[PDB]
A paper describes a structure:
Rco1 recognizes unmodified H3K4 (H3K4me0) via its PHD1 domain and associates with Eaf3 to enhance the Eaf3–H3K36me3 interaction.
To gain mechanistic insights into the Eaf3–Rco1 interaction and the preference of Rco1 for H3K4me0, we solved the complex structure of Eaf3MRG–Rco1PHD1–SID–H3K4me01–12 at 1.60 Å resolution. In the ternary complex, Eaf3MRG adopts a canonical fold similar to that of MRG15MRG, and buries an area of approximately 2072 Å2 with Rco1PHD1–SID. Rco1PHD1–SID interacts with Eaf3MRG via three interfaces, with two for SID (interfaces I and II) and one for PHD1 (interface III). The Rco1SID C-terminal region contacts α1, α3, and α5 of Eaf3MRG, with the loop between α3 and α4 interacting with Eaf3MRG via hydrophobic and hydrogen bonding interactions. Unexpectedly, Rco1PHD1 also interacts with α3, η1, α4, and α8 of Eaf3MRG via electrostatic and hydrophobic interactions, albeit fewer than those found between Rco1SID and Eaf3MRG. The interactions between Eaf3MRG and Rco1PHD1 raise the possibility that Eaf3MRG allosterically reinforces the Rco1–H3 interaction by stabilizing Rco1PHD1. Consistently, ITC binding assays demonstrated that the Eaf3–Rco1 complex binds to the H3K4me0 peptide with 5-fold higher affinity than Rco1PHD1 alone (KD values: 22 μM vs 110 μM), underscoring the Eaf3MRG–Rco1PHD1 interaction mediated by Arg300 and Arg303 of Eaf3MRG. Similar to previously reported PHD complex structures, the H3K4me0 peptide lies in the negative surface of Rco1PHD1 by forming a two-stranded antiparallel β-sheet with Rco1PHD1 β1. Collectively, the first five residues of the H3K4me0 peptide are specifically recognized by Rco1PHD1.
Author numbering:
A (entry chain A): 218 to 400
B (entry chain B): 258 to 375
C (entry chain C): 1 to 6
Amino acid sequence: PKISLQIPIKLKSVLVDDWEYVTKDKKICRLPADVTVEMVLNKYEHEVSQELESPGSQSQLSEYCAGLKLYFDKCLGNMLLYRLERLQYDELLKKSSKDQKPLVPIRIYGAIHLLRLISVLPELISSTTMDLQSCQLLIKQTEDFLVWLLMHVDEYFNDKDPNRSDDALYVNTSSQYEGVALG
Amino acid sequence: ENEDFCSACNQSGSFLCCDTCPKSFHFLCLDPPIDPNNLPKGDWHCNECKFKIFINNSMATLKKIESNFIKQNNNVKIFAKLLFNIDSHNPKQFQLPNYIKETFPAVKTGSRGQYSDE
Amino acid sequence: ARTKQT
Ligand SMILES: [Zn+2]
Ligand SMILES: [Zn+2]
């Protein structure tokens, strides 16, 4: 059975914009992000847990957010970057090594990379032996998160263009960076 | 013989080659990225091969290995199988799935995966 | 380790 995930069209459009910025315009994200994955999911859990009555609902929400954070930390360098961004990633790792502390992706990357991970959850779930009930619950929790994220598109996905602001979500790459990263 | 393209991004260029399988990878496409000024002196194996090398030299079976991990990760149970699978798969370039791309008929995918709007 | 160009 194909795993289907409902992503609101405005958030699909954010992901397509991202694809255009990195692979056509040769932009990458400004890192560390002003708003990190950890910050997004802390705000999400704090807000929606207040509107929750069942102790089992609260438990499931907390487990989902904790697992998503850990999974993002394991996925980021394995599968969530376009080729251009791998040079930036290598530099972050080298910096972390110098600092003698492991790189923690949820404290560096931001909402757009979380949204990337969400978009590829269907294929990742289908490559496991998760039973159908857990597949259903994981998809449902993800869709509930996306409903909340859509309501916050201004908070997390505005002011993206580095050709309009020196504070934007993305930065331009130099031709030297691009040459190193893309051969 | 090793392959002519990067397994992670499917493009040409300079690669590190796996010593137990045909795959080749750009230095920067690896996880972690390998520095070409500090290349490994001995053999090198991709993440997928490394995992199988791990499993084989294990006293327990891959089913049991997986079982203990899930027990160990009960606090994040719904993600435990997803988390366990990571280390058995080589790194790859991110690509948007077709169910996202197809929502935007004016957008095309170029020959290296790039966004194109003609 | 072995390298390759192509
Ligand atoms: Zn590559
Ligand atoms: Zn291999």
